[PDB]
Paper text:
Human islet amyloid polypeptide (IAPP) is a 37-residue polypeptide hormone that is co-secreted with insulin from pancreatic β cells and plays an essential role in glycemic regulation. IAPP forms amyloid deposits in the pancreas of >90% of individuals with T2D.43–45 A single genetic mutation resulting in a serine to glycine substitution at residue 20 (IAPP-S20G) is associated with familial, early-onset T2D.46,47 Recently, cryo-EM structures of IAPP amyloid fibrils assembled in vitro for the wild-type (WT)48–50 sequence and IAPP-S20G48 have been determined, as well as those of patient-seeded WT IAPP. Here, we used cryo-EM to determine structures of amyloid fibrils at different times during in vitro fibrillation of a disease-related variant of human islet amyloid polypeptide (IAPP-S20G). Strikingly, the fibrils formed in the lag, growth, and plateau phases have different structures, with new forms appearing and others disappearing as fibrillation proceeds.
The fibrils present after 6 weeks, which represents the growth phase of fibril formation, are strikingly different to those observed at the 3-week time point. More surprisingly, and in marked contrast to the single structure solvable to high resolution at 3 weeks, six distinct fibril polymorphs could be identified at this time point. However, four fibril structures could be solved to high resolution (3.1–3.4 Å). Interestingly, the IAPP-S20G variant generated two major fibril polymorphs, which are each structurally different to WT IAPP fibrils, with different subunit folds and fibril crossover lengths (~45 nm for IAPP-S20G and ~25 nm for WT)48. The balance of sub-unit folds underlying the different fibril structures also changes as assembly progresses, with the P-fold found in the earliest fibrils in the lag phase, followed by the L- and C-subunit types in the 6-week sample, with the L- and U-subunit folds dominating at 22-week time point. The structures can be divided into different lineages based on three different 2PF cores.
Author numbering:
A (entry chain G), B (entry chain E), C (entry chain C), D (entry chain A), E (entry chain I), F (entry chain B), ...: 13 to 37
The structure:
């Protein structure tokens, strides 16, 4: 089993970016 | 089994970006 | 079994972006 | 079995974007 | 079993970046 | 005499803002 | 005499801001 | 006489800011 | 006479800032 | 007479700053 948890992350500004704040499997 | 959890993430502004705040499998 | 959960995510503004705040399988 | 859950996501403004806030299979 | 936990991370500004604030498997 | 000229300005997305792209006197 | 000229300015995304791209007198 | 000229400025993303890309007198 | 000229300035991302890319008099 | 010229300046990311890339008089 694989568990991925993402919580309470604040991102100000994202430009021309990939795989940011994501659960990539 | 694979578990992906995404919660409570604040994103200010996103421009020309890919796979942001997503559960990609 | 695969479980993907998406909850309580606030997105300010999205421009010319792909796969944002999505459950991609 | 595949389970995809999408809830309580607030999107401010979306322009020229693809696959945003969607359950893509 | 693999457990990945992401919480309470503040990101000011992200430009032309990859795999930032993400659980990559 | 006061001259104010506003031309050819492209605005992507505006949220909770005041006095944007305006000639304020 | 006061001359203010505003032309050809591209703004991606504006959030919770004041006096942006404006001729304020 | 006072001359203020604003041209060809590209702004990616603006958050919680004041007097950005403006001719303030 | 006072001449202020602003041209061809690229700004990536601006957060919680004042008097950025402006002709302040 | 006072002449101020601003051209071709690239700014990556600005946070909590004052009087950046501006013609202040």
């Amino acid at each position: 089993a694989n568990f991925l948890v993402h919580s309470g992350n604040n991102f100000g500004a994202i430009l021309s970016s990939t795989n940011v704040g994501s659960n990539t499997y």
